[PDB]
Amino acid sequence: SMNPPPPETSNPNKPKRQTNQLQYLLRVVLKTLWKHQFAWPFQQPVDAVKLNLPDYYKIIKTPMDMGTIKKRLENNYYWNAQECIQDFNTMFTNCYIYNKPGDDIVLMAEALEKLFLQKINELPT
């Protein structure tokens, strides 16, 4: 297909372990962004077929979205908080390098990124 398989969200042989930062990433960061008015373009992988973006996966080499991030957190996929932060950053980068700077999608991404950074700056140690 035009669309890749979605990113893996299960880590079957990794031990399950909570950390304060991962709890924060799920219960504060992801929860706040997931419920935001502008979350909808970002809650699932970009469907280049339905959205008619035949070049999307030519430009975007590392697809990422909040649906994948949510599942990863809910499955304890990440070994540490920085991996999860990196996925958020990748999501936003993809949006900013593919879409035109004036597009409404970019304005929505910036509002979410602002909120993301606001929450990340209060990440527990």
Ligand SMILES: Cn1cc(-c2ccc(C(=O)Nc3cc(-c4ccccc4)ccc3N)nc2)c2cc[nH]c2c1=O
């Ligand atoms: C990251 N990213 C994402 C999307 C994306 C992803 C999903 C949608 C989607 O679901 N639209 C939708 C919206 C409505 C709706 C919403 C609000 C009010 C009324 C109607 C209804 C149906 C559909 N289908 N749109 C754009 C996208 C496009 C171009 N570039 C990107 C991009 O980089």
